[PDB]
Design a protein around this ligand. Sequence first.
Ligand SMILES: O=C[C@@H](O)[C@@H](O)[C@@H](O)[C@@H](O)CO
Ligand SMILES: O=C[C@@H](O)[C@@H](O)[C@@H](O)[C@@H](O)CO
Ligand SMILES: O=C[C@@H](O)[C@@H](O)[C@@H](O)[C@@H](O)CO
Ligand SMILES: O=C[C@@H](O)[C@@H](O)[C@@H](O)[C@@H](O)CO
Ligand SMILES: OC[C@@H]1O[C@H](O)[C@@H](O)[C@@H](O)[C@H]1O
Ligand SMILES: OC[C@@H]1O[C@H](O)[C@@H](O)[C@@H](O)[C@H]1O
Ligand SMILES: OC[C@@H]1O[C@H](O)[C@@H](O)[C@@H](O)[C@H]1O
Ligand SMILES: OC[C@@H]1O[C@H](O)[C@@H](O)[C@@H](O)[C@H]1O
Ligand SMILES: [Mn+2]
Ligand SMILES: [Mn+2]
Ligand SMILES: [Mn+2]
Ligand SMILES: [Mn+2]
Lengths: 240, 241, 240, 241
Amino acid sequence: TRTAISRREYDEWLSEAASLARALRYPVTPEMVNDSAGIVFGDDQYEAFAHGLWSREPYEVMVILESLNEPAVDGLPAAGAAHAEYSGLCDKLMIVHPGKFCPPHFHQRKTESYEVVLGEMEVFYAPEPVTVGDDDVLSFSPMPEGSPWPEGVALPAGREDSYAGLTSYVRLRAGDPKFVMHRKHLHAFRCPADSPVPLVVREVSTYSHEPAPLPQWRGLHDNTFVAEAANSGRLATAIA
Amino acid sequence: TRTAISRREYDEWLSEAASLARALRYPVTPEMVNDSAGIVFGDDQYEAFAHGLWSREPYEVMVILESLNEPAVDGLPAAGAAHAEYSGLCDKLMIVHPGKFCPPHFHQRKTESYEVVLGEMEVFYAPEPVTVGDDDVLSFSPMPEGSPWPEGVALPAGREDSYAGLTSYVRLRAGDPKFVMHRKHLHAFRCPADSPVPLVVREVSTYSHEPAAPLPQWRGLHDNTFVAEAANSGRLATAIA
Amino acid sequence: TRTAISRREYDEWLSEAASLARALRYPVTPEMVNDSAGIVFGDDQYEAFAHGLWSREPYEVMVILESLNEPAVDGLPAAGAAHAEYSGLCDKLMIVHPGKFCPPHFHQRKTESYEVVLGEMEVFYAPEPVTVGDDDVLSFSPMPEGSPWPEGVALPAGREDSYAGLTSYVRLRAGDPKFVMHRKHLHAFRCPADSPVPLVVREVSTYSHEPAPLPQWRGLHDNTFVAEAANSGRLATAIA
Amino acid sequence: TRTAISRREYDEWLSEAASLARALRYPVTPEMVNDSAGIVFGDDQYEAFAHGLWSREPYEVMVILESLNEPAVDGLPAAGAAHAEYSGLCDKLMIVHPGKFCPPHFHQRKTESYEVVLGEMEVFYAPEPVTVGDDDVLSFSPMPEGSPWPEGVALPAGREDSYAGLTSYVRLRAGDPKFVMHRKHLHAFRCPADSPVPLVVREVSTYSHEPAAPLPQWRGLHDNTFVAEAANSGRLATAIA
Ligand SMILES: O=C[C@@H](O)[C@@H](O)[C@@H](O)[C@@H](O)CO
Ligand SMILES: O=C[C@@H](O)[C@@H](O)[C@@H](O)[C@@H](O)CO
Ligand SMILES: O=C[C@@H](O)[C@@H](O)[C@@H](O)[C@@H](O)CO
Ligand SMILES: O=C[C@@H](O)[C@@H](O)[C@@H](O)[C@@H](O)CO
Ligand SMILES: OC[C@@H]1O[C@H](O)[C@@H](O)[C@@H](O)[C@H]1O
Ligand SMILES: OC[C@@H]1O[C@H](O)[C@@H](O)[C@@H](O)[C@H]1O
Ligand SMILES: OC[C@@H]1O[C@H](O)[C@@H](O)[C@@H](O)[C@H]1O
Ligand SMILES: OC[C@@H]1O[C@H](O)[C@@H](O)[C@@H](O)[C@H]1O
Ligand SMILES: [Mn+2]
Ligand SMILES: [Mn+2]
Ligand SMILES: [Mn+2]
Ligand SMILES: [Mn+2]
C-alpha cells in the first residue's frame, strides 16, 4: 500500500495543475505552487497514486491553488475581534481529477461559494446545519434542499459511510451562478468519474484557518472531517 | 453638455460589457445586466458619451457586474451581530474603458481585493487609513507604500483635486498577485488611456452595502464615501433617455 | 435611410470586436483592425446602424478579423498554377451580433470550415453544390443533408427570398467539431436573435479572393452573392 | 534505457494534453485522444519518460490533437487532380513540454502556419527550400531571414547535428502574427526549457498526408521527411506497455 507520493508524481501533478490554472487565466504565482498545494486526505488515500489521477478511481485527493487568504482584520473595530475569525477573504482554485473527491467536512467559521470554471462539480451536502456549541446563531437564507443523489456515484473505499449525512445534491456547471455553502454545513464534492477534464472550481470564501493576524487565530484549525482518517493527513503531504 | 445616456448607448455599453465578461468566463445571468450596472459618477460625467467610451477622454464612468453579495450571516454566533456588516462575501467584475476612472472614495466596512483579468489597472490610493465609526481598531497588514504617480495621467475635468489624497500608485497586470485594498483607505483606479482593450478586473471583497435586510442594523446602510461631492449622489442612479 | 456609418459607430464596433477577440485569445494585430474589417453588405444594410448592433434586428453586417490569408503558392509546381486559386490558407475570426447575418453566397474556389468560439451559429445552406461551368468536378465527401430550418428565423427585409435556396440547417455551438462548407455551395449564417453574446466564429479555409501572388489571381473576386444588392456594397465600408 | 511508455504514462500525458486543449477552447472530441496522438520520434526518445515530461530534458516527443484534415477535393475541377495533394485544410493543436522538441523535417506538399496559444515557441528553420518532386516551382513570398540562434539551447542527445541545417531562428509568442512555414523548408521547434507551462500552438495548414483515399494517387502518400534517420520511422507508431 502506498504511503507517500514520489517527487516526480507530485511535481507532474502540480505542474499540470498550475498550467491548466494559467490556461484558464487564474493568477498563479510561483509561491502558490508548493509542496502543500497537493492534498492527500489520510495516509490510506496515498493509494490514489497507485494507478494515478486518471484512473478515475474514487479517492479523496486534490490540488488547491490559493491566490488569496486575507484576514481583513485591519480597520476592524476591536469590539469585533471575537468574531473576526468568521470573516476575512479567501480565493482559491481547486482542481479535482475524474472520480476524485474533496472529503466530507464542515467549517465552524468558514462560509464558501463555488464558481465552476471547467468540467462539472457534483456537490453532496447536509441542508441542515450542524449545531456546534448551541449559542444563539443567526439566520437569513438557509441552504436550499437540493435534490437526491443521482445513481452511480462511487465513494472512496472505507470512507463511504462518512458521506451518509450529506443527503442533498447539486450539479454545478461552468457559467452557473455562484453556489453558497454556509458555515456549519457538512459538504463534499467530486469530479464526475466520466469527465473528460479535471474539475476546476474557484472558491471564494471567508478566511481559511489551516495551520497570527490575531492572537486568538493562533493554531486555529477550522476544518473538521467526518472521517477520522482525513484529519491526520493533509497536515503535510508525504513526498518521497 | 448632456445629462443622460440614450437607451441605445446604455444597452450597447452593457451588452458589450456582459459579452466580454462571458468571454472571460465570468458567471453572468440576465438579472445582472440591469439599469444600475452602468455607473456614471455625477451628472457632469454623462458627458463621457458625447464622444463615447472609446474617445479615451478622462471621465468617471464604469460597469459593474455583480455575481455575488452574500451577507454570510447564516451560522454566525448572535454575539457577532454588531460587526457582521464588516464581513460577508462579494464578487463582481468591473469594466472600465480606456482613460476612464472609478473615482476617489473609501469604505468604512468593505475590504476589497483586485485580480486583473484583461488590460492593466492603475490604482491610486492613500496608504494611511481614515477613522470612521470606531476609533479603536485592529491592525495586522498595513497598506504597502506603492510608488509615486507615473507621468502623463489625465484626470477628469473639474475633479482633479479630489485625487490629491491618493498619493500612492501601483499598476496591476493580469497574473499579478491579488492586491488588497483595506477598508477605510482612499482609493481609485483607471484603465490606461492608451489601452487597446477595456480594463476588466475581478473584485473579491466583503459585503457591499449599496442602497429584507440580513440584519435590522443593515437597512439603508451606506458604505461608499466619495471624496468629490458631485460623485456620491450621482452613483445612486443612471439617467437613461 | 442610413447611407453610411459614423466614425464613432464604426470605431466602437471594431474596438469592442477586437477586444472580444483578444479576450478569446485570437491573435489580433493592429493592422487587422481597419476600415475594411467592418462589413455592410449593400447600401440598404447601413440601416442596421439606425438602431444599432444590439437592436437584434435582421441585417447583413459583420466584422471579420483576418489573421491569415496565405496563397501557399511558394514551392507549388508550376503545373498546378491553374488550380492554385482553389488552395491557400486563410484564418479569420468573424463576429456577428444578435439577429445579424452573413448573407447568402457561394465560392467557386473557396472551401471553408467553422469553429464556434462563443455563442451559437445557425447555418443555412444548400446541400447540393451549384454547377458553375460544368467541367468535370471531383467528389469525395458531399455535404450532409442537415435539418429543416427551425421556426422563428427573421431574415433581413428585402433579402428574404435570397435565402430560398438554402434549405438545410445546422446549429453549431462552441466545442462542437469542425463543420466544413465545400466550395460551390450556397450558404449563410446568423447569430440567434435571442443570443446574450455576439457569435464569434473562427473560419479556417482556402485563400480568400477579395480585392498578386500569381498573375491569374489579379482582380479575382471569389464571392458571389445571391442578392444583387450585397455585391455592390462590402467593396468599401462607407464611414462618415 | 526504455523502449516503451507505460499505459499510465501515455494516458496521463494525453489526458492532461486534451484537458489543456479544452481549457484553451480547442474543439476536442474523444476520437481525437487516441494511441497515435502522443508521438515519440525514434526508439531512443522513449527515454524522455525515464524522468518525465517535466524533467526539462531535451527529447523529441510531443502530442498532436487534430481537429481537421479536409482534402478539400470536393468541387475541384478534375483538371486539378494532379496537385490537389498540395492543398486541403488541416487544423491541429500541438502540445510540447518544457525543453522538448518537434524534430527537424520538411514536407514536400504541406505548407503550415503557427499560432502560439500558450507558452512560447522557438522555431529553428532553413530559409532556403529543397527541391522535391518537381523542379519547376512557383514563388511569391520567400521565407524570412529570421535571427541567429539564441544562446543556451539544449538539443537532444545523439541528434545535435540533425539541427545543423536549421540556421534561422524566431521566437513566437501568443498574440504574434501568424507565422508561415512554406512547404519544402526544413524546420523544427521547441518549448523553452525554462517554461512554466507546456507550449500549446495551433497549426493551420494544407492537408496532412500521414499513413478510402480522397484520390487514388493519395494512397500511402508520405509527406514527412525527417533529417534524422532514427526519427522518420519512430513516428509511425507509439510503443505502449
Ligand atoms: O470545500 C472545501 C474548502 O473548504 C477547501 O478549501 C478545503 O476543504 C481544503 O483546505 C481541503 O480541506
Ligand atoms: O473600488 C471600487 C469598488 O469599491 C467598487 O465595487 C465600487 O466603486 C462600486 O461599488 C461603485 O462605488
Ligand atoms: O462564410 C463567409 C466567409 O466566406 C467570409 O470570409 C466571407 O463571406 C466574407 O468576406 C464576407 O463576404
Ligand atoms: O512542424 C510540424 C508539423 O508538421 C506537425 O504537424 C508534424 O510534425 C506532425 O505531423 C508530426 O510529424
Ligand atoms: O447508496 C448506494 C448508492 O450510492 C451511490 O453513491 C448513489 O449514487 C446511488 O447509486 C446509491 O444507490
Ligand atoms: O448574459 C446576459 C445577457 O447579456 C447580453 O449582453 C444582454 O444584451 C442581455 O441579453 C442579457 O440577458
Ligand atoms: O418561411 C417562413 C418562415 O421563415 C423562417 O425563417 C423560418 O424559421 C420558419 O419560421 C418559416 O415558417
Ligand atoms: O475530451 C476527450 C477526453 O479527454 C480526456 O482527457 C480523456 O481522458 C478521455 O476522457 C477523452 O475522451
Ligand atoms: Mn469546505
Ligand atoms: Mn472601493
Ligand atoms: Mn463564405
Ligand atoms: Mn512540419
